[PDB]
Design a protein around this ligand. Sequence first.
Ligand code: FAD
Ligand code: FAD
Lengths: 519, 519
Amino acid sequence: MAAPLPEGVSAEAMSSALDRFARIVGADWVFTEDKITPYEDPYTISNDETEHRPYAAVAPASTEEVQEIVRVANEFGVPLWPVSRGKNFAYGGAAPVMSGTVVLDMNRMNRILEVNEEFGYALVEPGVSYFELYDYIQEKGLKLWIDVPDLGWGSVVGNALDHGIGYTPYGDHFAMQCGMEVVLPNGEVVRTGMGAMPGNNTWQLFKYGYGPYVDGIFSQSNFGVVTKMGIWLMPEPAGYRPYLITFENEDDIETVTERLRPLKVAGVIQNGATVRSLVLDAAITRTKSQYYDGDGPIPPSVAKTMMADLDLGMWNFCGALYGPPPVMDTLWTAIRDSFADIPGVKFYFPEDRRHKVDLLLHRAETMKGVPKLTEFNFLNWDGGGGHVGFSPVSPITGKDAIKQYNMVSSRVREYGFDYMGLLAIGWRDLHHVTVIVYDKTDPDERKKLDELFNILVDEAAAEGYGEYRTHIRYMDRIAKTYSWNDNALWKMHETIKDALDPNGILAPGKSGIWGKNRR
Amino acid sequence: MAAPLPEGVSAEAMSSALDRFARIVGADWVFTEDKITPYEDPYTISNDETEHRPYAAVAPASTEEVQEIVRVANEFGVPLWPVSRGKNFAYGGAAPVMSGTVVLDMNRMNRILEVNEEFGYALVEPGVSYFELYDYIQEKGLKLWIDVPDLGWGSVVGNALDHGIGYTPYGDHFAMQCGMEVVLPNGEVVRTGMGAMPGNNTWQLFKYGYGPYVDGIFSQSNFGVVTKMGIWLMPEPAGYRPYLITFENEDDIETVTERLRPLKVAGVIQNGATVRSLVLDAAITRTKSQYYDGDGPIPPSVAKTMMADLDLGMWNFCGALYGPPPVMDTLWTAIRDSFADIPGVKFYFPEDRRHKVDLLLHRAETMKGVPKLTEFNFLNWDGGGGHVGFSPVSPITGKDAIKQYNMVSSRVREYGFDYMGLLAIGWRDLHHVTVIVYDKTDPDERKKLDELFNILVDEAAAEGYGEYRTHIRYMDRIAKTYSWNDNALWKMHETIKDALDPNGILAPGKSGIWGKNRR
Ligand SMILES: Cc1cc2nc3c(=O)[nH]c(=O)nc-3n(C[C@H](O)[C@H](O)[C@H](O)COP(=O)(O)OP(=O)(O)OC[C@H]3O[C@@H](n4cnc5c(N)ncnc54)[C@H](O)[C@@H]3O)c2cc1C
Ligand SMILES: Cc1cc2nc3c(=O)[nH]c(=O)nc-3n(C[C@H](O)[C@H](O)[C@H](O)COP(=O)(O)OP(=O)(O)OC[C@H]3O[C@@H](n4cnc5c(N)ncnc54)[C@H](O)[C@@H]3O)c2cc1C
């Protein structure tokens, strides 16, 4: 079934828009039905073929082409779905919320404008991948690390703008942003911060500039198209020691989280360290069928067998030390002493791992910013599937961690899926990302996944828990959970949306923001 | 003379608005006529008595009262100048850019809503001083440090919103902000981040929440009235050692800045440490009259006498080590060895200071977040005066540092003032704050200061340098320096301003933003 036109847009208006796009970028870089396949969500959820369908895609190579595309979209009322690389797998890929939207694919805008060793930053266009930035740094011999969101195939820009997370001390990607160029929804270009000062030498050095600090309004947003972004990069440290602490019991996560809090708030845990559930870690190197012939989630005997076979716990705390040996030794004494009295606790450095293909050796690369595709391995757990991320935020407190674990694991397993949970340790919070692996080709599994996801969102909200990020299908539902004072914040967002994008031609539905024409 | 009415506002409209303000807050809390003098800039620059004059002030006690004040302001077109404590001395005090504006003074909203030791944060109303938060923590024996912008009598909220800076690892005040409540210019109230989730326990734990990240648009801004704000606080560390490294030659700042860069980018220098010029440091414990009889700036022979008398350099690098003794020792080796080969360098810990009253013993308190009022001491240098901050931003590069020093020192001294320079070390930048001390009672000194300030701004902009913060008198001038792409950024600011504040009743002129009715 082909994509429907967006509501209120005639075939004539769409067809005039697409010819104009082709004049701007060249005929090779407008993709219509029967080249639109790569822009579909790779991990389908809806059984309604009219939903989340991109009409077409346009692939510009310059900010100027982005501006002309945006001006043409305003002229014809043709909505755009901007993506940097479009690898938002488990959140919709490159697909739009609203069917009929045209993807604005910035993959070919892939210039690394600068990597500065002395100040530790990069200035990049959206199409720059983690692989590409990492390779540029290695080729030029620069003593910098990047921060990778597990997968290296995505965008330094796009991932940051979606509030993405990685696992070095620079793991809060958007927090490490400094300076950006934005094509506003009227086609005008602005630079934030010190970029607004002609002849500046500080765009990537001082976030604020002068006046209102607006960079964050273009993150998880449809207020503009970001065409250049700065990011701070960590200097190569004087030492690096990855570690893995494992826990025997699902209920250990309560005491473990209580012990993590003071270590993280004091900066003793230097990186975006993680606590990962057994199945998420096992699925990197094994499949369910190697331990169990059953059709549903694993029983306790299978969990215990996997733990003994792979030297994993029910909970696996993976982190790294950074800096000179006397600093790393001091921090390690504090971390080790915080967990050493928990019955069933085990400690590993990489040299202690018996298996040649092992989760710690993979995470040792991730926590020094090596781009990889290893994380897709968990999709093989049940014979090959897609995934969706249920990502509530939790305080770093055991009560909240064990509550969310119980609420999510119970429901996922009830719906036939194994629980695969990541607790990513932020400055003062935990990002609880549950990856639900399902057969995206089976309409019955898709139906179950959709019902489960709605339950997870509703039960979490009923407990005062909100998600930090979501799939295109649930962006309205999540926005409706942030309802304080009769949806006051989204009323403000819509006010700003109508001022910057009166014609509503930028990603209608992103973060539940639609604009007056479609509200 | 008395304040003029704001342009376009009738005596009747002003009179009606002020009566309605008294109905909201109570008759005791609207200030007119003789009661307005505390809201005047204490450090007058203009020789025109019609400029920067508040008409009146209103002092609410609740968010509800702020909302009703804003609604009434819209009804009568009476503009407001919101302040938290109004102690913005060196940038206008509590005075508005536009004469006739009514100050919205939130001093009486001074609840500490929560100080959380486990998570290291406070949730505060605008009227909470650094003194009050420090005294609360000390009374309750909480193991938390605050971060003070030298002076303790200003607002944890107000200072952060103006992008203020301090001297501990938590020195970037706005960066430590997490969650805020805002009264929008229509009088509606919003909470940012996880505050938008009813029943949340994460407002002060996770900055972003979901969707566009807007907190920053209410900093250096007239887009809203902040009524509550969270801030992260540093857990008390396991050790603390403050230090002073002095340099004999004004030209040492070039190589000293080159050495600071890699130490700061790698986080070896843990705090917002500072490099302060001779006279700025001398002026904390001495006056010019104790070394010199002339009424203009000091000659070289006098600087050499001051240096030997006080154990200060032409440049004084003041920082602190934080953490366990093995961490502090490892970082100290790296910092010390960076400077040890510079001819004339001297290294001091507090026990090496021979003066009982001494610059290092003062800053030892500041760099562990002890609130004080001793920074006003530099106002005595030339007999007593006010000050204005010329605050350009510089890369952490010797070339830029020595250029700004030469450009500013030369002009300030040419206009009869001594150079007092602060280079506050941020993550990747230097905030170059030059405090110009002048007789604010002398119209001739005020004329020279105003002429000097305009020259400093223009010359810095000619060299691609912009200010991070400025006085009410120069907010338009500084906005016009950020002119990239025909003032694209300010055109966007005005677009958002007209959307959130169509009647332009919030702080017209703040950061050079006026709104359609007054631009
Ligand atoms: C197995 C697996 C593991 C994963 N692990 C992680 C992980 O560890 N960390 C993590 O953060 N994510 C993770 N993800 C989610 C996701 O795959 C990555 O975050 C990915 O990097 C995002 O795609 P991207 O970088 O190409 O961003 P894009 O898809 O280019 O951008 C994401 C969204 O941001 C907006 N956007 C992007 N660029 C712009 C722009 N220039 N202007 C305006 N709006 C823009 C759009 O709404 C877009 O849809 C994982 C997914 C899977 C399936
Ligand atoms: C000798 C001396 C030393 C100084 N040292 C420092 C220093 O080390 N660090 C430093 O940062 N500054 C310094 N200053 C500048 C200044 O005095 C302080 O920053 C002071 O704390 C700011 O006043 P405040 O905290 O009362 O903020 P306020 O005056 O309350 O706020 C400042 C401005 O922010 C806006 N604002 C405030 N609250 C709100 C709100 N609720 N909603 C909307 N807008 C709001 C308004 O525009 C207001 O005018 C110094 C000044 C002097 C004279």
